[PDB]
């Protein structure tokens, strides 16, 4: 049975590689504190305080907390991530299991200056999953508070909150309030455990590979085309130079002129920034020159935006202003961190199919030329979908997110999340957890006011998550060797992806998925 | 099994709408304190202290406490109440379940100035239901201490007491004393739980609708009657004007004169008060002008009294003095609260069938006229049941009571409770709960006096209540759209029926049931 003196689960951290499948399992130790002193609170921000209109909000913070494993380093060790990206053309999630076990509730009393902590054996926690998607879904915004990448670390559970419609700092009639105690929930004492299972819906494999061809090079280099293009509008001669028409076939020496079947993907142009700072304009342009969208009178940066190549050849010092993912190095500051404290990703691989984020999409015609008027052209800085476009998605990273919830709407176009990962109409459900309030002694004459005098408590336990992943094997006939992700050979003060002398785990660099190649 | 380390129940708050039925379930957290230091006490009030004869009483307070869920906001969220009142002509209760679980007994010791709290694992609580209706039934007086409307709040359990017959502050031979330890009771330690079920007896549906016709307008407007009425007692002419008899048929232009089948319901007249205070008489008349009944030498206000319309057309600023239900706004004072701190209900819908509370019922004849004496009339300020009367009951509110117990008597007339809701001869039974006394250490030489030295204790737990309700669907052929209960569209500082910045839940207004319409 389950009692005070027996454990309700075991520690599972493992990975198993079987054929076309890999199964990861992770266990961590968590600590859960009481939030808001058991209260729900209205929160808002408005111009009155001095915020700009672009930052206003209205919402609620709750006493509850939630579990989040939406980063890949929750499930994969760095060596496992190497096995995946060097050997496979793609992967996708299939199913998951979740367990919550070995739960301990503790009470802390304050007397004079000294603080003491004891067990409370009869207290509970409450847990439920939102399986019908009835709550605002705050997973998928890339918040802090996921399970830690390193299995020995103990993490704090984050507080749940949400936003609803606002006008300035005020609410409107359509604004919704939610009470989370209004769902069914399971209550657990120190001997109880909790578990559920979930199945992923069909989703396309993430493409982990780069193309070894480019979209404008798909032709046979040895042969002419049978089609023709207009090669000459004027006679080339001694003196006159009158109007003429002349035509040529496309061939090996004019590839720019040949007829083609396909177009590069869409473009929304970003401003370019150099990591060599003396090359940048001297001014503070991050917001005023930023790439933005405009919704209901608010301006919001398109960050990272649609997938575009970070730079062209030999340009690596440049990046789009708001167009890339940027991670932190360990102990990086929250505000105004220096360039040496952060890690910049590069989407450079998709340069074959996708326009570079800092250039125009192309050129079109402005006017109607004639004998009287010379022709004029114009530059295309944003281009939506054209028939014949092909494109790649943004890459995924070991530090980065896995899935997002597709918003429930009448229409969408190519619902792949812009921060990267798998779009899901029915994502893995969110998991809510709370300490049950325990009153301090009531008065001995009746009073109708709600009791707000409590014994301070927190809880701890273990959590397990297990995901099964499907693999897509690499089939290539390429003769020469591939690029692989590898560790450095040379000696160093510390080992990458390990602890230091102080005990702190760190991740030296971001690692994407695209190493193997494939024909376009 | 059930032990210290396992939970004995789960959190259920939900509503399920199925066909003609809706099922509500609510869970709250409660705290129970020791009352009267485990004693029974005689209580009384008499003129000697300076109370008036109208307020005297004799009775007993007990160490026990009781559970009360007799308000509708215990079972319905504001959105659920909207679903009910906008879509349905009626509803009634069918059956209920009750659970009591996850019980924690705590002991508190006082030393010097510091106070400490610990678990006591072997202590019990006692619980019983009075299924045979053998105790004075104090539910149905609209007392404070029901389960809170908002599910996250923790509430204190109220102390049980009762009154018996008095003469002044003294008792009489017929007065009864009750010991609640003289019933069988269930004892629970921290692993035990308690439950029972109950079935409601057949009761008429509450009418949630207003009439779209009035009782004096039921005729066909296009046609004459074949009956006649006395239209003239005197000749209309040049000079003489002698006695005559003349007769006319009732028709479209005289509806006041037509013959009719039915009468308005009963009347007991209330004094009228304006919310514009400059229109009221300058004097303190609330008690001296109040509407009263008289029983065994005591005067008691008829509050709210029989169901009557609050005001007539375009009169909304007026209300009957003691004739309506009045709720409080959050943080309203207990005594001498201002008009802006309270919420006044309106029975305005029943104006079609029911007399207005502040006017006479009608006119009758005083005398016998003749050639010598002119006719005299008199005003009817109170009227009991006449054959041919029809009437509506008072409406129910989300903040208001659900049922009352019909007193056990030889006779009653239309036993619908005057504060509103369902009259029941066998109501849901009352549920009594108490902490079992634990002695402090006794002396080591025997003493016969009862031990009155105890360890201070209180308990906490969860309580669940589930009610199934039957619905009566709306059948109407009305072409134009109905009135509906709706939230306001415009922006505001807070959301109605939510928490504020401080965490306090409030209810902005009272909400009745009558929106849909029905033919008379």
């Amino acid at each position, epitope marked *: 049975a389950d009692g005070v003196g027996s454990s309700s689960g075991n520690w599972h951290c493992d990975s198993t590689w079987l054929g076309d499948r890999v199964i990861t399992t992770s266990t961590r130790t968590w600590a859960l504190p*009481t939030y808001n*002193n*058991h*209260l729900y609170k209205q929160i808002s921000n408005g111009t009155s305080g001095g915020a700009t209109n672009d930052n206003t909000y209205f919402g609620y913070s709750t006493p509850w907390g939630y579990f989040d494993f939406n980063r890949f380093h929750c499930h994969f060790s760095p060596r496992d991530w190497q096995r995946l990206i060097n050997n496979n053309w793609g992967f996708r999630p299939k199913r998951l299991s979740f367990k919550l076990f070995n739960i301990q509730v503790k*009470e*802390v*009393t*304050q007397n*004079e*200056g000294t*603080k003491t902590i004891a067990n409370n054996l009869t207290s509970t926690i409450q847990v439920f999953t939102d399986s019908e998607y009835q709550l605002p879904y705050v997973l998928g915004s890339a918040h802090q508070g996921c399970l830690p990448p390193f299995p020995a670390d103990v993490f704090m559970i984050p507080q749940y909150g949400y936003l609803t419609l606002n006008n300035g700092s005020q609410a409107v009639g359509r604004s919704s309030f939610y009470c989370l105690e209004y769902f069914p929930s399971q209550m657990l004492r120190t001997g109880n455990n909790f578990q559920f299972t979930y199945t992923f819906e069909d989703v396309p494999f993430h493409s982990s590979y780069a193309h070894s061809q480019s979209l404008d090079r798909l032709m046979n280099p040895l042969i002419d085309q049978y089609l023709y293009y207009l090669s000459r509008t004027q006679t080339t001669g001694g003196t006159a130079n009158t109007q003429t028409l002349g035509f040529s076939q496309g061939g090996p020496n004019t590839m720019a002129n040949q007829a083609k079947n396909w177009l590069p993907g869409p473009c929304y142009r970003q401003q370019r920034v150099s990591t060599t700072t003396g090359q940048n304009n001297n001014s503070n342009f991050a917001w005023t020159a930023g790439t933005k969208y405009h919704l209901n009178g608010r301006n919001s940066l398109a960050n990272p935006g649609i997938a575009m190549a970070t730079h062209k050849d030999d340009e690596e010092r440049f990046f789009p202003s708001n167009g890339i993912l940027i991670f932190g190095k360990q102990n990086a500051a929250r505000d105004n961190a220096d360039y040496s404290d952060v890690m910049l990703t590069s989407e450079e691989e998709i340069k074959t199919t996708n326009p570079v984020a800092t250039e125009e999409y192309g050129i079109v015609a402005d006017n109607l030329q004639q004998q009287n008027t010379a022709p004029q052209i114009g530059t295309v800085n944003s281009q939506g979908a054209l028939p014949g476009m092909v494109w790649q998605n943004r890459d995924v990273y070991l530090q980065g997110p896995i899935w997002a919830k597709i918003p429930h709407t009448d229409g969408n176009f190519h619902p792949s999340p812009l921060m990267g990962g798998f779009g899901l109409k029915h994502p893995p459900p969110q998991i809510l957890i709370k300490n049950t309030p325990v009153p*301090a*002694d*009531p*008065p001995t004459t009746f*009073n109708q*006011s709600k009791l*707000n*005098s*409590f*014994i*301070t408590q927190y809880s701890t336990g273990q959590v397990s998550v297990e995901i099964e992943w499907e693999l897509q094997k690499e089939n290539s006939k390429r003769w020469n060797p591939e690029i692989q992700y590898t560790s450095n050979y040379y000696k160093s003060t510390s080992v990458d992806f390990a602890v230091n002398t102080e005990g702190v785990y760190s991740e030296p660099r971001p690692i994407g998925t695209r190493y193997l190649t494939r024909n376009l | 099994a059930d032990g210290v380390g396992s939970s004995s129940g789960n959190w259920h708050c939900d509503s399920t709408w199925l066909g003609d039925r809706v099922i509500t379930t609510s869970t709250r957290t409660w705290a129970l304190p020791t009352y009267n230091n485990h004693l029974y006490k005689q209580i009384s009030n008499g003129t000697s202290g300076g109370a008036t004869n109208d307020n005297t009483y004799f009775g007993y307070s007990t160490p026990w406490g009781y559970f009360d869920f007799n308000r509708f906001h215990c079972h319905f969220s504001p959105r659920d109440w909207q679903r009910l009142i906008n879509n349905n002509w009626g509803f009634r209760p069918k059956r209920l379940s009750f659970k009591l679980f996850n019980i924690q007994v705590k002991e508190v010791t006082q030393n010097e*100035g510091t*106070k400490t*709290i610990a678990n006591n694992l072997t202590s019990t609580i006692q619980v019983f239901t009075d299924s045979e209706y053998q105790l004075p039934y104090v539910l149905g007086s609209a007392h404070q201490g029901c389960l809170p409307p908002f599910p996250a709040d923790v509430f204190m359990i109220p102390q049980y007491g009762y009154l018996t017959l008095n003469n002044g502050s003294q008792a009489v031979g017929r007065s009864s004393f009750y010991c609640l330890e003289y019933f069988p009771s269930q004892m629970l330690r921290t692993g035990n739980n308690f439950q029972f079920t109950y079935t409601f007896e057949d009761v008429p549906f509450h009418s949630s609708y207003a009439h779209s016709q009035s009782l004096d307008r039921l005729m066909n407007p296009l046609i004459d009657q074949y009956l006649y009425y006395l239209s003239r007692t005197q000749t209309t002419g040049g000079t003489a004007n002698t006695q005559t008899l003349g007769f006319s048929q009732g028709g479209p232009n005289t509806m006041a004169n037509q013959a009719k089948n039915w009468l308005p319901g009963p009347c007991y007249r209330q004094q009228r008060v304006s919310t514009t205070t400059g229109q009221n008489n300058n004097s303190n008349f609330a008690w001296t002008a109040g509407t009263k009944y008289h029983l065994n030498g005591r005067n008691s206000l008829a509050n709210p009294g029989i169901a009557m319309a609050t005001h007539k057309d375009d009169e909304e600023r007026f209300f009957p003095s003691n004739g309506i239900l009045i709720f409080g706004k*959050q*943080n309203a*004072a207990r005594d001498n609260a201002d008009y802006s701190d309270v919420m006044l209900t309106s029975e305005e819908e029943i104006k079609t069938t029911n007399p207005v509370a502040t006017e006479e019922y009608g006119i009758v004849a005083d005398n016998l006229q003749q050639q010598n004496t002119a006719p005299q009339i008199g005003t009817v300020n109170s009227q009991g049941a006449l054959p041919g009367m029809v009437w509506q009951n008072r409406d129910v509110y989300l903040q208001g009571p659900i049922w009352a117990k019909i007193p056990h008597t030889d006779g009653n007339f239309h036993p619908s409770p005057l504060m509103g809701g369902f009259g029941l001869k066998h109501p849901p039974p009352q549920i009594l709960i108490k902490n079992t006394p634990v002695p402090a250490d006794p002396p080591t030489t025997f003493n016969q006096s009862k031990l009155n030295s105890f360890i201070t204790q209180y308990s906490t737990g969860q309580v669940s209540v589930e009610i199934e309700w039957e619905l009566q669907k709306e059948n109407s052929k009305r072409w134009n759209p109905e009135i509906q209960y709706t939230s306001n569209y415009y922006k505001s500082t807070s959301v109605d029926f939510a928490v504020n910045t*401080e*965490g*306090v839940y*409030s209810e902005p207004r009272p909400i009745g049931t009558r929106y849909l319409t029905r033919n008379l």
Partner: nanobody
Amino acid sequence: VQIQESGGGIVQAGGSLRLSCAASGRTHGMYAMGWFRQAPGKEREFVAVQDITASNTHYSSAVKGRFTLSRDNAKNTAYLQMNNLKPEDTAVYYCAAGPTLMSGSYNSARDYDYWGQGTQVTVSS
């Protein structure tokens, strides 16, 4: 929701001084009412706190055995009576209020929403 100080003054050592505090509105607020003090050039220190029903009360170690905290819900006010004053009790006392009382966290300033202007109490020997 204004808290307001009163009863400030200067006293000789051993005297009995009484600080007072009042609020306006939200009796569904002001659940817990308490006192802090900040001496010249020093950190703010929690002095006392009591809840609405008077069930739970706490005093600072230095404060205990000399001060008593009392409360009147009718007037929506709270009082602090002070006995056997020592000149290290010169400080600026703040009335403080909050929606909740916790057993672990009550002595932290993080748990109080509202703060008065303060009072100066001087104690001389």
